[PDB]
Design a protein around this ligand. Structure first.
Ligand SMILES: *[C@@H]1O[C@H](CO)[C@@H](O[C@@H]2O[C@H](CO)[C@@H](O[C@@H]3O[C@H](CO[C@H]4O[C@H](CO)[C@@H](O)[C@H](O[C@H]5O[C@H](CO)[C@@H](O)[C@H](O)[C@@H]5O[C@H]5O[C@H](CO)[C@@H](O)[C@H](O)[C@@H]5O)[C@@H]4O)[C@@H](O)[C@H](O[C@H]4O[C@H](CO)[C@@H](O)[C@H](O)[C@@H]4O[C@H]4O[C@H](CO)[C@@H](O)[C@H](O)[C@@H]4O)[C@@H]3O)[C@H](O)[C@H]2NC(C)=O)[C@H](O)[C@H]1NC(C)=O
Ligand SMILES: O=C(COCCc1cnn[nH]1)N1Cc2cnc(NC3Cc4ccccc4C3)nc2C1
Ligand SMILES: [Ca+2]
Ligand SMILES: [Ca+2]
Ligand SMILES: [K+]
Ligand code: NA
Ligand SMILES: [Zn+2]
Length: 799
């Protein structure tokens, strides 16, 4: 009903209620603007730059921007007004000067935040395009920057922008791809069209809502595509001239480039120089505009991308028609990832298991790998949403997957794409922060985009809604406004059992072929005399209510769950000089009752004998015993965990070969290993009534995963157990699977496939914290913020 008018309402901030016509920055997208929106609000006359002959002109209100004497007071000068007409310098030509305090106009309650978001801005553009992006390069060198910023999976636009806005993984915010089916709604979300505007898709609490709820006004973050960039910038700078009571504190600009061109020309096509130059010019406009308004040393600016861009061509497409015979009974969400479901919910013939097998290791150079979503690397956090199909295809970088060839030529064109695994170098993107609240000329380590919501809340004095960041892990980016977290309180205190049971009280079906000077010696070990060696960073805290026992040994310390009948964690340190030994022949099947732990809170060997699918392994490896006599400790029933034979191939190679490899490379390592139970694939520790599988005929729960956290000195001239400074960590969460079908080369020796498996399942300490309810690194000499940064680190193994 578009017969109202935008007179006095151009880019109004509160969207008004239909059937009233709209004048906001989204009205175009809803085909809902007032009849006169173009005429009044999208003025273009005379373009975007003052020229010497316009200087001091008489205001003509038709003009796109103004060069008249009254423009600064009206807040609508062209951004280069002061340069052309008042002998000022462009911002980019001024020397960098530390911004120690906000230098703001009277009436500003807080430094505004401007988020300058760029689509497809691959991390290596900062170096490779540096000659053509002077404004961006100045932000980067003068402010705070990371070498790259890791997006979320899938590395698609809307998932990543909405993660930037919420601090949530896609599985939690609900935007799990650029297209989606929700079976509860029975509704589909797509790029073209109108279902995507329905608020039911968009979960969590984005920043603009966080701000508004806490009394901080926000600019609208979404811009209709036909609003030119120059007008987006002028609109931000006009909002910044509003009266104090009406002026927002937070704003966003969005550019469709360089992604748009990247799809057509590839990430480094010669056609890509011009898009980068144009984005740089836009930054130049904003910064000159801010300088004219005396806000260039007041506003915090974030320059951030959503994802990178890889080389991808029509010829590098895998077709499911080459694998499946039944291709017409499936629906594929295709491209740089695959999602499969049945075409019809009425077809009771459809079998996921037979689709997975038809897609598993079928061609020698196969460029995708099928997964049930719960088997995807836990670092992707891509499973706990009904909109994510059970069957997933992880597509190799530089490829696509499509159902049938006709899907590719009845739709070559494109040379770039994105969406792959968020660890891929080509998918990484950019972060720069510049302003009074950011540090000066500071480089920070790469970090994940899920962290930025909390920092944007810190920048605006807002309490963040509950999110997937680790608040405090990015304190090192900030001069002021840091968030001073406290360590979580321990909820369950351990028991410290002594010798309480005689050997003959145990009837576990286990067998094992097993001085005065050093009778004293081993009592001291059982009491915790080596614990300083093996537990370097304090006991992990247990953050839920449970019953557990600390068990000390010569070579390792454990926290043993009376509820799960196995350790929650097992801690041990392996020096650079440590020797690997074998399991002696007489000890191959040895399992020994632990006289500190009741038969009733023990595992039993008969269950493993009866369970024809399930075997067992050990958390502290017998191979790394300090002596023949200490080795007996490794065969305690309290160090045993359930393991599928297929998984024991992986585990044994880790423990026999890789631990000592790491200790020799890193100058000792401290290892914490344990089980994980996540049968509902939510990324969070299961309660015991959530466990779906037990060792047959027993109450021994079967883990879904095994973790290890491997810590050493960042200065590897110091040994792990005498480190004065910062730490270095790598971690994994390995799937506990009954086959090695994930690894196509598993018939080969473990030296050819195990380590590549472990790399794929690399993890953050924080990932393990969520999955176990444990809190690590409780007793170090480091600041808590530094430890939080360490807990968020991911070792990615990219070149
Ligand atoms: C990443 O960070 C996020 C945010 O912190 C973490 O997610 C949170 O985790 C909590 C635990 O899983 C969860 O808390 C539960 O929420 C229920 C209330 O939920 C609504 O209200 C909130 C608040 O405004 C809202 O955010 C929710 O939004 C979700 O759902 C809507 C759809 O309505 C989506 O638009 C939105 O995208 C979001 O979806 C995501 O989360 C849901 C779960 O809520 C998933 O199903 C989706 O797939 C998607 O991932 C909701 O609108 C509350 O009812 C729960 O309490 C029950 O559960 C326990 C038992 O387990 C029990 O103590 C209670 O008594 C109660 O039990 C009864 O209900 C049971 C379940 O129905 C029933 O079976 C029993 O028999 C009982 O009757 C619970 O507190 C919180 O909602 C989410 N939040 C978000 C935004 O996702 C996430 O864990 C972090 N990830 C990692 C790895 O750390
Ligand atoms: O059309 C899309 C996306 O299309 C996907 C298609 C595609 C294919 N390959 N690549 N992309 N748009 C239009 C649009 C408008 N305005 C914003 N504003 C942003 C600014 C900002 C800053 C922080 C957090 C959130 C936001 C939202 N974002 C967008 C994204
Ligand atoms: Ca994008
Ligand atoms: Ca769980
Ligand atoms: K068995
Ligand atoms: Na295999
Ligand atoms: Zn794109």
């Amino acid at each position: 009903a578009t017969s109202g008018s935008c007179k006095g309402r151009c880019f109004e901030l509160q969207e008004v209620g239909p059937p009233d016509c709209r004048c906001d920055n989204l009205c175009k997208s809803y085909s809902s603007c007032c009849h006169d929106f173009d005429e009044l609000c999208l003025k273009t006359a005379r373009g975007w730059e003052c020229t010497k002959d316009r200087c001091g002109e008489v205001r003509n209100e038709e003009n796109a921007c103004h060069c008249s004497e009254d423009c600064l007071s009206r807040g609508d000068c062209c951004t280069n007004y002061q340069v052309v007409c008042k002998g000022e310098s462009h911002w980019v030509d001024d020397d960098c000067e530390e911004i120690k305090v906000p230098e703001c106009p009277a009436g500003f309650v807080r430094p505004p935040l401007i988020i300058f978001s760029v689509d497809g801005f691959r991390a290596s553009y900062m170096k490779k395009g540096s000659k053509v992006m002077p404004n961006i390069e100045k932000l980067r060198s003068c402010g705070t920057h990371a070498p790259y910023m890791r997006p979320v999976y899938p590395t698609k636009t809307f998932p990543n922008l909405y993660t930037l806005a919420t601090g949530l993984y896609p599985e939690s915010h609900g935007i799990v791809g650029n297209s989606m089916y929700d079976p509860v709604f029975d509704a589909s979300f797509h790029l073209r069209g109108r279902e995507k505007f329905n608020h039911r898709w968009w979960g969590g609490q984005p920043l603009w809502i966080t701000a508004t709820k806490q009394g901080v006004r926000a600019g609208t973050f979404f811009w209709s595509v036909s609003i030119p960039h120059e007008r987006r910038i002028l609109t931000i700078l006009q909002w910044l001239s509003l009266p104090d009571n009406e002026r927002p504190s937070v704003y966003a600009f969005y550019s469709e480039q360089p992604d748009f061109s990247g799809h057509k020309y590839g990430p480094f096509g010669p056609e890509m120089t011009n898009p980068l130059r144009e984005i740089d010019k836009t930054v130049g406009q904003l910064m000159d505009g801010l300088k004219q308004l005396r806000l260039h040393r007041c506003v915090n600016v974030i320059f951030v991308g959503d994802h990178g861009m890889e080389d991808v061509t029509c010829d590098r497409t895998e077709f499911l028609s080459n694998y499946l015979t039944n291709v017409d009974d499936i629906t594929l969400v295709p491209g740089t990832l695959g999602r499969i479901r049945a075409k019809s919910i009425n077809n009771s013939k459809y079998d996921p298991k037979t689709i997975i097998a038809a897609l598993t290791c079928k061609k020698p150079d196969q460029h995708f790998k099928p997964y049930m979503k719960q088997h995807l690397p836990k670092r992707l956090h891509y499973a706990n949403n009904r909109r994510i199909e059970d069957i997933h295809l992880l597509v190799d970088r530089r490829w696509h997957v499509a159902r049938k060839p006709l899907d590719v030529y009845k739709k070559c064109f494109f040379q770039g794409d994105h969406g792959f695994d968020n660890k891929v170098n080509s998918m990484q993107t950019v972060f720069v922060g510049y302003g009074p609240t950011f540090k000066y000329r500071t480089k920070v380590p790469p970090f994940e985009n899920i962290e930025l919501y909390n920092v944007m809340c810190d920048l605006l004095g807002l309490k963040p809604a509950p999110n997937n960041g680790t608040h405090g892990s990015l304190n090192h980016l900030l001069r002021t406004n840091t968030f001073r977290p406290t360590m979580p309180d321990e909820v369950s205190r351990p028991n410290y059992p002594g010798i309480m049971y005689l050997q003959s009280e145990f009837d576990l079906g286990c067998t094992c072929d097993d001085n005065k000077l050093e009778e004293l010696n081993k009592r001291l070990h059982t009491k915790g005399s080596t614990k300083e060696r093996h537990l370097l960073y304090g006991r992990p805290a247990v953050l839920y209510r449970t019953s557990y026992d600390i068990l000390y040994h010569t070579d390792f310390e454990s926290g043993y769950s009376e509820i799960f009948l196995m350790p929650l964690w097992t801690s041990y340190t392996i020096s650079k000089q440590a020797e690997v030994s074998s399991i002696p022949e007489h000890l191959t099947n040895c399992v020994r009752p632990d006289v500190r732990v009741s038969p009733g809170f023990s595992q039993n060997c008969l269950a493993y004998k009866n369970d024809k699918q399930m075997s067992y392994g050990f958390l502290f490896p017998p191979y790394l015993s300090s002596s023949p006599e200490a080795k007996y400790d490794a065969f305690l029933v309290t160090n045993m965990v359930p393991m599928y034979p297929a998984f024991k191939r992986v585990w044994a190679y880790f423990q026999r070969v890789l631990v000592k490899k790491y200790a020799s490379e890193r100058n000792g390592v401290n290892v914490i290993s344990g089980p994980i139970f996540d049968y509902n694939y939510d990324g969070l520790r299961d309660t015991e009534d959530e466990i779906k599988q037990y060792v047959e005929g027993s109450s021994i729960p079967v883990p879904t995963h095994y973790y290890s956290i491997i810590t050493s000195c960042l200065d590897f001239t110091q040994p792990a157990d005498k480190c004065d400074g910062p730490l270095s960590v790598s971690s994994f969460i390995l799937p506990h699977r009954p086959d090695n079908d994930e690894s196509c080369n598993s018939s080969e020796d473990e030296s050819k496939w195990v380590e590549e498996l472990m790399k794929m399942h690399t993890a953050r300490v924080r990932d393990i914290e969520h999955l176990t309810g444990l809190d690590f690194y409780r007793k170090t000499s480091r600041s808590y913020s530094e430890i939080l940064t360490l807990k968020t680190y991911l070792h990615t193994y990219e070149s």
